């Protein structure tokens, strides 16, 4: 007990004495030791009440209204998974503060005079933090959309049938799998196909865009059409070869490179 | 003592933009390159912007300006090519800018082929020596590629960071130890920090480090060099509201600092002081932790006016001026008191003793 | 590997590159040095191909791919 007075004889800020109770946690199981510490428990319980009040105030601000959503979008985290991560972090901090209360008051803190309200608030706030509704809604929306990449690679201005959202769904699956939500099998296959076909689609659309701008430049200067006829008919023949192919075709592995190379040549 | 030494901002370029990354030129310490992503309001504006500010002169406007069609998620100085600046973009297309050349368009851009980067590149660095060096770039799909500045058309080397059988790693941050060219550390979106090896029999992910329950935001190795070799220590800041100190040899974190009340988006070691590092959180708060003075409270703290979501922090190679970029494109530069920045002669021994205390 | 970086720090043409390659034979087989070789191959082998497009030049090609140069995937062509 003299050493537990030297605790305040040495400690300055609340974090250090929190850590001291954490290290000495078993020693307060003794009845005399538990009765020795009475006036500091109220101080730390009030500080934990202040901190959980701060958590409540943070959670009052909606997730889109918070900087968390903006910085999650800036760091490539999709918004639904960003909200899931935000709720999970708030849940983690709530659990950490509950463990801090358990350490400060010792075992049997749920029946303590001050720990009853803390336990009730933690239970209600954890119930409110349940995230399964967000995953259910997102999965329902994605399934109802019924996105599909299968089909011809090209369609006729030239275009490639590959939207940006197909990547966002893959990233959503990527984060939600780590978060432990059981993604459905069909969504997993769609994300798989998205991940495989994304770089080929990027190469194809970049090549089409490059060919479009180069063709516009050539048409704007008609005097130089003859020297560039070979590259023009070569890329047109490759494009015609690509009309019959589908996204499931094995010919895409070299093609999206090879055509692009000729298109790259067609620039120089 | 933290005093706002300077206030950098441009109404045309940096307005309505977040600062995606910062970097200082090693040869010219007065220079500061910073990156800015796409403007939300005006699609007519170029998406990625890279601005070079100066500390020698009081010129409010940027010393140099560059831009490119895709949002520049990372930018850096070529440590052995002072006339060049490199930048990784949201499209994955790495871009190069030459100050000698007057073109705002990039002078050299990598392709967007499958072998090249296609996912966003949040991680670009220059590693090697003056006699020879490589531009290492890691994307968010786990793809790592080494390029050469003289030729960005073809990747000099490329592979994928794969660990735990069929599972990629979504690298968010990277770092290299001082004096190390082959080994590095990366931070996944899943919170697991992976120590990886560039070339070797086990090239790829080598070791897993667990403990972070949120995505990693920033990793930095011990850049301070002294008598006692602390190059094996590195710090990580994540979405756990925590800054965790780790040893490369130890698979669990050496220590955790939980004082932050929001996400911690960036942390980095003081380049001169061994035990001092600085982190910046989402409440607009910049916190300098000195482990030779305290371990549960920041040694110094300051709040940025307006409380913007602070994104990035960097130190000067001298170790005094700290430049931090926020979510309003409002780069703010602070000067620290000499009692904090400069280390005492026993700070290394004291740091070793405090590590032994853990 | 620091010595390997110093090789490019020293050599300027292809002949000195091949000389300092010949001085170092064990480095071709261990699967850590080859990454550095992959940095130099694009500088040398392609250049040697550009020179070809005889037995001396096949020796030039061999000196970059090590002993039994016909086994490598690039040495097959």
From Swiss-Prot, chain A:
Superkingdom of origin organism: Eukaryota
Location(s) in or outside the cell: Cytoplasm, Cytoskeleton
UniProt region (Interaction with DYNC1LI2), positions on chain: 87-225
TM stretches of this protein: none
Function as written in the Swiss-Prot or TrEMBL entry: Cytoplasmic dynein 1 acts as a motor for the intracellular retrograde motility of vesicles and organelles along microtubules. Dynein has ATPase activity; the force-producing power stroke is thought to occur on release of ADP. Plays a role in mitotic spindle assembly and metaphase plate congression.
Domain comment quoted from the record: Dynein heavy chains probably consist of an N-terminal stem (which binds cargo and interacts with other dynein components), and the head or motor domain. The motor contains six tandemly-linked AAA domains in the head, which form a ring. A stalk-like structure (formed by two of the coiled coil domains) protrudes between AAA 4 and AAA 5 and terminates in a microtubule-binding site. A seventh domain may also contribute to this ring; it is not clear whether the N-terminus or the C-terminus forms this extra domain.
Family the entry assigns: Belongs to the dynein heavy chain family.
Disease: Charcot-Marie-Tooth disease, axonal, type 2O: An axonal form of Charcot-Marie-Tooth disease, a disorder of the peripheral nervous system, characterized by progressive weakness and atrophy, initially of the peroneal muscles and later of the distal muscles of the arms. Charcot-Marie-Tooth disease is classified in two main groups on the basis of electrophysiologic properties and histopathology: primary peripheral demyelinating neuropathies (designated CMT1 when they are dominantly inherited) and primary peripheral axonal neuropathies (CMT2).
Assembly information from the UniProt record: Homodimer. The cytoplasmic dynein 1 complex consists of two catalytic heavy chains (HCs) and a number of non-catalytic subunits presented by intermediate chains (ICs), light intermediate chains (LICs) and light chains (LCs); the composition seems to vary in respect to the IC, LIC and LC composition. The heavy chain homodimer serves as a scaffold for the probable homodimeric assembly of the respective non-catalytic subunits. The ICs and LICs bind directly to the HC dimer and dynein LCs assemble on the IC dimer. Interacts with DYNC1LI1; DYNC1LI1 and DYNC1LI2 bind mutually exclusive to DYNC1H1.
Protein's name according to its UniProt entry: Cytoplasmic dynein 1 heavy chain 1
Species annotation: Homo sapiens (Human)
Organismal lineage: Eukaryota, Metazoa, Chordata, Craniata, Vertebrata
Residues of the full protein shown: 565 to 845 of 4646
UniProtKB/Swiss-Prot annotation, chain B:
Chain positions of WD repeats: 14-63, 67-107, 116-157, 166-206, 211-256, 259-299, 305-344
Superkingdom of the organism of origin: Eukaryota
GO molecular function, one term: dynein heavy chain binding
Subcellular locations according to the entry: Cytoplasm, Cytoskeleton; Cytoplasm
PTM remark: Pyrophosphorylation by 5-diphosphoinositol pentakisphosphate (5-IP7) promotes interaction with DCTN1. Serine pyrophosphorylation is achieved by Mg(2+)-dependent, but enzyme independent transfer of a beta-phosphate from a inositol pyrophosphate to a pre-phosphorylated serine residue.
Gene Ontology cellular component annotations, sorted alphabetically: centrosome; cytoplasm; cytoplasmic dynein complex; cytosol; dynein complex; microtubule; vesicle
UniProt keyword annotations, A-Z: Acetylation, Cytoplasm, Cytoskeleton, Disease variant, Dynein, Host-virus interaction, Intellectual disability, Microtubule, Motor protein, Phosphoprotein, Repeat, Transport, WD repeat
GO biological process: microtubule-based movement; transport along microtubule
Associated clinical condition: Neurodevelopmental disorder with microcephaly and structural brain anomalies: An autosomal recessive neurodevelopmental disorder characterized by global developmental delay, severe intellectual disability, microcephaly, dysmorphic facial features, and cerebral malformations including simplification of cerebral gyration, agenesis of the corpus callosum, and brainstem and white matter hypoplasia.
Assembly information from the UniProt record: Homodimer. The cytoplasmic dynein 1 complex consists of two catalytic heavy chains (HCs) and a number of non-catalytic subunits presented by intermediate chains (ICs), light intermediate chains (LICs) and light chains (LCs); the composition seems to vary in respect to the IC, LIC and LC composition. The heavy chain homodimer serves as a scaffold for the probable homodimeric assembly of the respective non-catalytic subunits. The ICs and LICs bind directly to the HC dimer and the LCs assemble on the IC dimer. Interacts with DYNLT3. Interacts with DYNLT1. (Microbial infection) Interacts with human adenovirus 5 hexon protein; this interaction probably allows virus intracellular transport.
Family per similarity comment: Belongs to the dynein intermediate chain family.
Function recorded in the entry: Acts as one of several non-catalytic accessory components of the cytoplasmic dynein 1 complex that are thought to be involved in linking dynein to cargos and to adapter proteins that regulate dynein function. Cytoplasmic dynein 1 acts as a motor for the intracellular retrograde motility of vesicles and organelles along microtubules. The intermediate chains mediate the binding of dynein to dynactin via its 150 kDa component (p150-glued) DCTN1. Involved in membrane-transport, such as Golgi apparatus, late endosomes and lysosomes.
Name of the protein: Cytoplasmic dynein 1 intermediate chain 2
Organism field: Homo sapiens (Human)
């Amino acid at each position: 007990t003299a050493r537990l007075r030297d605790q305040l004889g040495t400690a300055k800020n609340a974090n250090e004495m929190f850590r001291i109770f954490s290290r000495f946690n078993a020693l307060f199981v003794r009845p005399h030791i538990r009765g020795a510490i009475r006036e500091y428990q109220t101080q730390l319980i009030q500080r934990v009440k202040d901190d959980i009040e701060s958590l409540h105030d943070k959670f009052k601000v909606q997730y889109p209204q918070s900087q968390a959503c903006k910085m999650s979008h800036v760091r490539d985290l999709p918004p639904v998974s960003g909200s899931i991560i935000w709720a999970k972090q708030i849940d983690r901090q709530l659990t950490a503060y509950m463990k801090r209360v358990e350490d400060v008051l010792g075992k049997g803190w749920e029946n303590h005079v001050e720990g009853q309200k803390l336990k009730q608030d933690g239970d209600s706030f954890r119930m409110k933090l349940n995230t399964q509704e967000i995953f259910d809604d997102w999965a329902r929306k994605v399934q109802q959309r019924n996105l599909g990449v299968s089909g011809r690679i090209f369609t006729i201005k030239l275009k490639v049938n590959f939207l940006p959202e197909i990547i966002t769904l893959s990233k959503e699956v990527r984060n939600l799998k780590w978060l432990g939500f059981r993604v459905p099998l069909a969504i997993v296959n769609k994300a798989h196909q998205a991940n495989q076909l994304y770089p080929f689609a990027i190469s194809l659309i970049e090549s089409v865009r490059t060919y479009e701008r180069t063709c516009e430049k050539v048409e704007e200067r008609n005097t130089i059409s003859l020297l560039v006829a070979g590259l023009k008919k070569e890329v047109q023949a490759l494009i015609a070869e690509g009309i019959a192919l589908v996204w499931e075709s094995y010919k895409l592995d070299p093609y999206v490179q090879r055509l692009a190379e000729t298109v790259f040549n067609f620039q120089e | 003592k933290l005093s706002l030494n300077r206030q950098f901002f441009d109404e045309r370029w940096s307005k309505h933009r977040v600062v995606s990354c910062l970097d200082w030129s090693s040869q010219y310490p007065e220079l500061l390159v910073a990156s800015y992503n796409n403007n939300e309001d005006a699609p007519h504006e170029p998406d990625g912007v890279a601005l070079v500010w100066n500390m020698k002169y009081k010129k409010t406007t940027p010393e140099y300006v560059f831009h490119c069609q895709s949002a520049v998620m990372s930018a850096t100085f070529a440590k052995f090519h002072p006339n060049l600046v490199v930048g990784g973009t949201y499209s994955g297309q790495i871009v190069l800018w030459d100050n000698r050349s007057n073109k705002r368009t990039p002078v050299q851009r990598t392709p967007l082929s499958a072998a090249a980067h296609t996912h966003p590149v949040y991680c670009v660095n220059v590693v090697g020596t003056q006699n020879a060096h490589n531009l290492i770039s890691i994307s968010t799909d786990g793809k790592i590629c080494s390029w050469s500045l003289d030729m960005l058309s073809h990747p000099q080397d490329s592979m994928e960071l794969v660990h735990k059988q069929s599972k990629a790693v979504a690298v968010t941050s990277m770092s290299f130890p001082v004096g190390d060219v082959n080994n590095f550390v990366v931070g996944s979106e899943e919170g697991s920090v992976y120590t990886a090896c560039r070339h070797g029999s086990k090239a790829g992910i080598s070791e897993m480090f667990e403990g972070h329950q949120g995505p990693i935001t920033g990793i930095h190795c011990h850049a301070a060099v002294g008598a006692v070799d602390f190059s094996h220590l590195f710090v990580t800041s994540s979405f756990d509201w925590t800054v965790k100190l780790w040893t490369t040899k130890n698979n669990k974190p050496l220590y955790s600092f939980e004082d932050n009340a929001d996400y911690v988006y960036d942390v980095m070691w003081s380049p001169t002081h061994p035990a001092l590092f600085a982190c910046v959180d989402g409440m607009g708060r910049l916190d300098l932790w000195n482990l030779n003075n305290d371990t549960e409270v920041p040694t110094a703290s300051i709040s940025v006016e307006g409380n913007p979501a602070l994104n990035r922090v960097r130190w000067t190679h001298s170790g005094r001026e700290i430049a931090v970029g926020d979510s309003e494109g409002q780069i703010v530069i602070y000067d620290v008191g000499e009692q904090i920045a400069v280390p005492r002669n026993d700070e290394w021994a004291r740091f070793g003793r405090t590590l032994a205390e853990i």
